[PDB]
Structures are given as structure tokens and as C-alpha cells.
Design a protein around this nucleic acid. Structure first.
Ligand SMILES: Nc1nc2c(ncn2[C@H]2C[C@H](O)[C@@H](COP(=O)(O)OP(=O)(O)OP(=O)(O)O)O2)c(=O)[nH]1
Ligand SMILES: [Ca+2]
Ligand SMILES: [Ca+2]
Ligand code: NA
Length: 325
DNA sequence: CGGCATACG
DNA sequence: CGTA
DNA sequence: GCCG
């Protein structure tokens, strides 16, 4: 088992679901306390289990696995012997964990804002609604739409949405294309938001495109909230006899950068962090969603495909469905 | 021990 | 600060 | 919290 998640296939469904979910609770709780290092270790340990070919049934099976030290091993040991880990359950039922989770899941609220509100004594969404003076426009939209945004978007919703985006994109710039990215590209059947990547086959034609796309979607009455090359929006999605609010991310990239943007925006988040860490620490190359830079030659790699990028980095290619780290 | 992804709005 |  |  290699140490970086980008070095091994990770399928969406696997053989250690309960163990990985418990470790991910501890990772999330570490994030709420500002401990990014502990968050990473717990996420990496959970991801190792997702990549295993069969269930862990005995503690011995963790020997040699990366990211399993005393703490993550004890969590697994308690789950194997008792079906529950006391530390995990204590986190789950803690006021701090529950409130930080509730607040950070609001669009416009991160860990830092959630933590400040927590320290001020705030605990519920109604607490926030009573003091709207405290809220940015973005947070007001996130709070008003919170219920709909807490409902998963179904893969079965996505195609009709892609068609409306494609119509606005085609008016904004004929020949421009729309690619579904994010978790849905990795095979997920649900998500918290839909992610689209827009480009045009003629380099440079995409300049200034996103404002034109947004204006057209707004004029069609589809945008409940927005506000360049990235837009984090709230869209109106049709439902039987009504509609629901959905989060949609739109990104524009020049075609020269499209494979890098496709790779970055397809995730998973941990996969991309691990891939960029591998690139820098093992290969000496700097990776982002625009390119891959050799800081010794001061040159950018050209890529025409995601396959090119994996080859550049000396890694076996993984299709999106195996990037569910 | 240092390091932990890397960007845009 | 927020967002991916 | 863990790796190197
Ligand atoms: N506000 C909010 N954020 C969420 C929720 N579920 C997951 N997240 C966070 C976890 C990650 O930091 C981030 C992942 O979103 P992305 O669109 O970048 O990733 P991906 O498409 O894999 O995830 P998704 O399936 O849409 O949840 O969103 C949720 O219900 N609400
Ligand atoms: Ca997203
Ligand atoms: Ca998504
Ligand atoms: Na949030």
C-alpha cells in the first residue's frame, strides 16, 4: 500500500465503510479545531481503508499500512471489538461538533466564522436569523436556502441542468462546451453541488466568457444567488409542481489548461491534495488547476489529456471513478 | 523535528 | 474572510 | 497524527 492516495485506485464503494466513516468524523472534528495536520492524517487513514481489497477483520491487518499509528489503530480496534469507538461517539454527541457542523454547512460560513459564532454563544440557525445584521449577503442567501441546500442533488437531476447551462453557454459563445466534473464525474449518485467546466476549442475565445454566461442565466430567471472565471451560485432547479434551490459551480478554462482544470475540479478533494503533494515533494513539480510547473527549468508542461498529466508525474493513470480518495 | 494543496471571488 |  |  503506497503512502499517497494518488498512487492507488480508490473506488466509490468499498469494503470498510464503517471504519472509514468513523475516522472521517475524527478528521472533521480536527478541522473544526483548526488542526489541519490531524485532519489530514485521519482522512488519509480513512482513505487507505477505502483502497483495501476486502474488510479489515483483525487488528493485525493494519500492520504495515501507512497512516495507521497508535491513535487510528485504537479507533479501528475499538470498532472491531465493540462495534463503537467511545471517542467517536463523544465527538458525535458534542455540542461543539454538532454546532460547528451545522454552521459550516451554511454557504458563506467557514470554520473561522462558525467558531466565532460558537464562542459568542450562538447554537442554531434561528439564532443566526434573529441577528441578520451579523450576516453577509452571501450568508443571508445560504441561510435562506439552507433547507433545500441540505437535500442531496440527484445524478438524475444533472442532465436537465446541464442542458440549461449549455443553452446559455452556446448563446454566450457558440462552440463553447460544458463538461460535468466533481463527484458526479467520479460516479457519485448524489452530491451537495453540481460542478461544470466550460472551455472553447479556440485558445483565447473563452476570455470574458463567464460574465456573459451568468448574465444569460440570470435573465432566464434561473439564478437565485451569485457573486471572473469561477462562479459559486444557487440555481433554481425544477421539481414536480415547483422547484428547489441547488448549488452549482461554474468554471471557465482556456483549452490549453483544460486537462489541468478537469483534473483539479474532478477531485476528490483528498485525491487532489495528495496529487499536488506528491508532485511537489516527490517529483519537484508544482501542480495546480492551470498547469504543472518545473521550477528548475522554469517551464510549464503541455498536456492534452489527464493521461498526459499522470504520465508527466510518473503515476499509473486512474480514471475518475478510482479517484474517490 | 517540518510539513501538511493551491488557487480564485 | 468566503469558495472550489 | 503521522511520515520521512
Ligand atoms: N456546504 C456543504 N459542504 C459540503 C457538503 N457535503 C460536503 N461538503 C464539502 C466537503 C468538501 O470540502 C466539499 C466538496 O465539494 P466539491 O463539489 O468540491 O466535491 P465533490 O463534488 O466531490 O463533493 P459533493 O459530492 O458535491 O459533496 O464540500 C454539504 O452538504 N454542504
Ligand atoms: Ca463544488
Ligand atoms: Ca460537487
Ligand atoms: Na460553509
Amino acid at each position: 500500500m503506497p503512502a499517497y492516495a494518488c498512487q492507488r485506485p480508490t473506488p466509490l464503494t468499498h469494503h470498510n465503510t464503517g471504519l472509514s466513516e468513523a475516522l472521517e468524523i475524527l478528521a472533521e472534528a480536527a478541522g473544526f479545531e483548526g488542526s489541519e495536520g490531524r485532519l489530514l492524517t485521519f482522512c488519509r487513514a480513512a482513505s487507505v481503508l477505502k483502497a483495501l481489497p476486502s474488510p479489515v477483520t483483525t487488528l493485525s491487518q493494519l500492520q504495515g499500512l501507512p497512516h495507521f499509528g497508535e491513535h487510528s489503530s485504537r479507533v479501528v480496534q475499538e470498532l472491531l471489538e465493540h462495534g463503537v469507538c467511545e471517542e467517536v461517539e463523544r465527538v458525535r454527541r458534542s455540542e461543539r461538533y454538532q454546532t460547528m457542523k451545522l454552521f459550516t454547512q451554511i454557504f458563506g460560513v467557514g470554520v473561522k466564522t462558525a467558531d466565532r459564532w460558537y464562542r459568542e454563544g450562538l447554537r442554531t440557525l434561528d439564532d443566526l436569523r434573529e441577528q441578520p445584521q451579523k450576516l453577509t449577503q452571501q450568508q443571508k442567501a445560504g441561510l435562506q436556502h439552507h433547507q433545500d441546500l441540505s437535500t442531496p442533488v440527484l445524478r438524475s437531476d444533472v442532465d436537465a441542468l446541464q442542458q440549461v447551462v449549455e443553452e446559455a453557454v452556446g448563446q454566450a459563445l457558440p462552440g463553447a462546451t460544458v463538461t460535468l466534473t466533481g463527484g458526479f464525474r467520479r460516479g457519485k449518485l448524489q452530491g451537495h453541488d453540481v460542478d461544470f467546466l466550460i472551455t472553447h476549442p479556440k485558445e483565447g475565445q473563452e476570455a470574458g466568457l463567464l460574465p456573459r454566461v451568468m448574465c444569460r442565466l440570470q435573465d432566464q430567471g434561473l439564478i437565485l444567488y451569485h457573486q471572473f472565471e469561477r462562479s459559486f451560485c444557487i440555481f433554481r432547479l425544477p421539481q414536480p409542481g415547483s422547484w428547489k434551490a441547488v448549488r452549482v459551480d461554474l468554471v471557465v478554462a482556456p483549452v490549453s489548461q483544460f486537462p489541468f482544470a478537469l483534473l483539479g475540479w474532478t477531485g476528490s478533494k483528498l485525491f487532489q491534495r495528495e496529487l499536488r503533494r506528491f508532485s511537489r515533494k516527490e517529483k519537484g513539480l508544482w501542480l495546480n488547476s492551470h498547469g504543472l510547473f518545473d521550477p528548475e527549468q522554469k517551464t510549464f508542461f503541455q498536456a492534452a489529456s489527464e493521461e498526459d498529466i499522470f504520465r508527466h508525474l510518473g503515476l499509473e493513470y486512474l480514471p475518475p471513478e478510482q479517484r474517490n480518495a
